[PDB]
Ligand binder design. Structure first.
Ligand SMILES: CCC[C@@H](C)[C@H]1CC[C@H]2[C@@H]3[C@H](O)C[C@@H]4C[C@H](O)CC[C@]4(C)[C@H]3C[C@H](O)[C@]12C
Ligand SMILES: CCC[C@@H](C)[C@H]1CC[C@H]2[C@@H]3[C@H](O)C[C@@H]4C[C@H](O)CC[C@]4(C)[C@H]3C[C@H](O)[C@]12C
Lengths: 513, 36, 50, 50
């Protein structure tokens, strides 16, 4: 409607003014103006802010700030999560064996004692106790009382605190083991169900409950059903998968259903941790944006600063505890500032400068400012070195840094919109006269070298790579000419002497200089 | 030598065929030795 | 390049190792020098002319 | 290209390519931390813009 009137006016007059279009109508205004100019048709006639920052502000707005207690609950939630997964992984047997083997290797002086463990809830004594418990529990797998022994082993294992790196390594190892088991199970299911339409009911009745022997598959082949008969063709791969599963069962030492339940609990705890962390960050996005407004004109665009600040917050929220009592807005601003500053020092200038050199440049700038204000005129490199404690050559080197490259389109002609890039010459091109000189030299050499005995010409072309594919030494040309590295030198010297005196080589003298 | 010019859209396979390698870092040259 | 190497071997000439980026009067000009002035960094030797 | 002195001159395409690569690498890093969807959405919008 409103656009239709403006279009009618423009068609009648063929042109429109900014005021008329604006009235009859920042990025939305520019988009509308661009659309209007389309006609000078059907698509434009028929036809939010598009700013990535305004949309970010909008999407962040639908959030609720957290009060002092509003964090505490979230905090405890996180702890529960992690605690759960600990209890989820305390039951894994191979973990304690790996811990003991790693500790023994450390005792073999392969690593520092303290690096292995961040203490416990003395290190050698606790390791000895752990080894004693492991040896007394591993040799008592006998079922009836073994469960209580394993429970006590895990409970004493709980008293220990593990480094995050190796704990995550153990978690990943368990995950890959479970992934191998699940991949084998999925291969079995695909080869038995899709290939033979094997009902799920039979799989539940047979596979579940034991999941160790081959009775669930091998003994089901005689069930008098079409799927059982069809399983004969794919019995080899299923049998191999069953063998792998039986081997893995030895490692697990537990019912696979228990492993599935443990993994389910671990996933629930991980999700809880994740949801808590998301809720925390969503609230703290406001803090992140508030901090990252002091670095506007530094080479990075506002949104890049905001995103780097968001990385630091996600790192803090994972490393924040409510025992200290620091109001997040005090344990978090540090990480945000660190991340933003490091990012500015890593991706703000095209020719990257290390962090330490950036700090040196900033310190030099601050000292120069102080000196300029104090003395009044200016600081010189000698005075800068005296005030800054440097050899006065490092100062000059730092001052000689290449600053920031000039845009190659900087209008410099000022007469025909010429750019700075039109006046930069190619310094590696070979002048056309030098190419002609090279060709003339080649011709002269070819002419002269034909004026001596063929053996001399061959020897000279062999030593110097004249028209040859590659240079050659004395012994190679000797192999060519059935002489040994001495007559060849003599003939070469004779030929050079012959070419030496004038009346045989005079144009070459002209080429020389 | 060619006698005609053809224009069309580029598949991801075509774009990988033109290239001689993938650019992974935003770096240009060393600030000290001026080497790539 | 090979051949230039042969020319050097024949006439036993060494490599310059230094270019000749000297200041010379532009082509087509002809005048008299009326003034010369030298500027040198603080930490240099100030050749006789300076 | 180096100019006389310690100065340089560069085309504007180097800046644009650097921005594209920085945002792409940041997004790839971010997709490993399992960040909240707000952050990845903002990162993808920025990548499209670049
Ligand atoms: C409107 C046109 C602007 C243009 C004429 C001005 C603006 C910035 C100036 C350049 C920069 O200072 C960087 C270098 C400094 C060196 O010392 C001398 C060369 C150098 C390229 C300068 C020459 C010229 O003076 C420039 C290009
Ligand atoms: C009025 C227009 C001025 C223009 C004729 C003058 C003023 C500054 C000069 C350039 C700058 O010095 C930077 C470079 C220096 C290099 O040594 C040679 C190339 C380079 C681009 C210079 C060529 C030219 O001479 C410029 C553009």
């Amino acid at each position: 409607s409103q656009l239709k009137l403006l279009v009618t006016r423009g068609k009648e007059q063929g042109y429109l003014t900014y005021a008329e279009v604006n009235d009859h109508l920042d990025a939305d205004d520019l988009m509308l103006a661009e659309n209007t100019a389309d006609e000078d048709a059907a698509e434009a006639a028929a036809q939010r802010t598009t700013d990535p920052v305004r949309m970010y502000m909008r999407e962040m707005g639908t959030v609720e700030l957290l009060t002092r207690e509003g964090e505490i609950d979230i905090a405890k939630r996180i702890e529960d999560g992690i605690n759960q997964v600990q209890c989820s992984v305390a039951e894994y047997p191979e973990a304690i064996t790996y811990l003991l083997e790693q500790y023994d290797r450390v005792e073999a002086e392969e690593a520092r004692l303290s690096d292995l463990i961040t203490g416990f809830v003395l290190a050698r004594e606790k390791f000895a106790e752990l080894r004693a418990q492991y040896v007394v529990t591993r040799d008592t797998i006998k079922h009836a009382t073994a469960q209580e022994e394993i429970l006590k082993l895990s409970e004493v294992f709980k008293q220990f605190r593990l480094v995050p790196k190796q704990f995550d390594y153990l978690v990943n190892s368990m995950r890959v083991m479970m992934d191998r088991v699940r991949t084998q199970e999925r291969l079995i299911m695909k080869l038995c169900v899709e290939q033979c339409k094997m009902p799920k009911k039979n799989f539940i009745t047979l596979f579940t409950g034991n999941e160790t022997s081959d009775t669930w598959f091998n003994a089901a082949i005689a069930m008098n059903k079409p799927w059982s008969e069809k399983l004969h063709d794919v019995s080899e791969e299923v049998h191999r998968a069953l063998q792998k599963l039986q081997q893995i069962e030895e490692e697990t030492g537990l019912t696979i259903e228990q492993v599935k339940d443990i993994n389910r609990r671990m996933s629930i705890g991980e999700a809880k941790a994740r949801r808590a962390k998301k809720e925390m960050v969503e609230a703290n996005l406001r803090l992140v944006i508030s901090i990252a407004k002091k670095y506007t004109n530094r080479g990075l665009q506002f949104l890049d600063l905001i995103q780097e600040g968001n990385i630091g917050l996600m790192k803090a929220v994972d490393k924040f505890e409510y025992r200290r009592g620091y109001k997040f807005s005090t344990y978090a601003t540090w990480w945000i500032r660190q991340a933003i500053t490091r990012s500015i020092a890593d991706q703000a200038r095209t020719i990257r400068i290390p962090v330490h050199m950036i700090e040196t440049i900033n310190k030099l700038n601050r000292i120069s400012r102080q000196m300029l204000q104090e003395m009044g005129r200016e600081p010189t490199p000698e005075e800068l070195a005296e005030r800054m404690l440097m050899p006065e050559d490092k100062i000059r080197k730092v001052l000689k840094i290449a600053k920031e490259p000039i845009s190659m389109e900087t209008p410099i002609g000022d007469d025909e919109d010429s750019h700075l890039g039109d006046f930069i010459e190619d310094t590696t091109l070979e002048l056309p006269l030098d190419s002609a000189t090279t060709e003339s030299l080649r011709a002269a050499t070819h002419d002269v070298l034909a004026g001596l005995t063929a053996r001399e010409a061959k020897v000279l072309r062999m030593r110097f790579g004249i028209d040859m594919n590659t240079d050659y030494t004395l012994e190679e040309v000797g192999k060519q000419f059935d002489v040994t590295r001495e007559r060849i030198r003599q003939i070469e010297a004779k030929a050079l002497r012959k070419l030496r005196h004038p009346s045989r080589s005079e144009v070459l003298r002209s080429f020389l200089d | 030598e060619f006698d005609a010019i053809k224009i069309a859209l580029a598949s991801p396979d075509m774009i990988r065929s033109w290239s001689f390698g993938e650019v992974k870092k935003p770096e240009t040259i060393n600030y000290r030795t001026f080497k790539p | 390049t090979p051949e230039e190497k042969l020319l050097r071997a024949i006439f036993g000439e060494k490599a310059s190792d230094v270019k000749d980026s000297s200041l010379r009067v532009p082509n087509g000009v002809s005048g008299t020098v009326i003034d010369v002035q030298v500027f040198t960094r603080d930490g240099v030797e100030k050749d006789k002319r300076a | 290209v180096p100019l006389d002195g310690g100065r340089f001159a560069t085309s504007d395409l180097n800046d644009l390519y650097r921005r594209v690569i920085n945002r792409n690498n940041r997004l790839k890093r971010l997709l490993d931390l399992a960040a909240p969807d707000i952050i990845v959405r903002n990162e993808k919008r920025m990548l499209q813009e670049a």
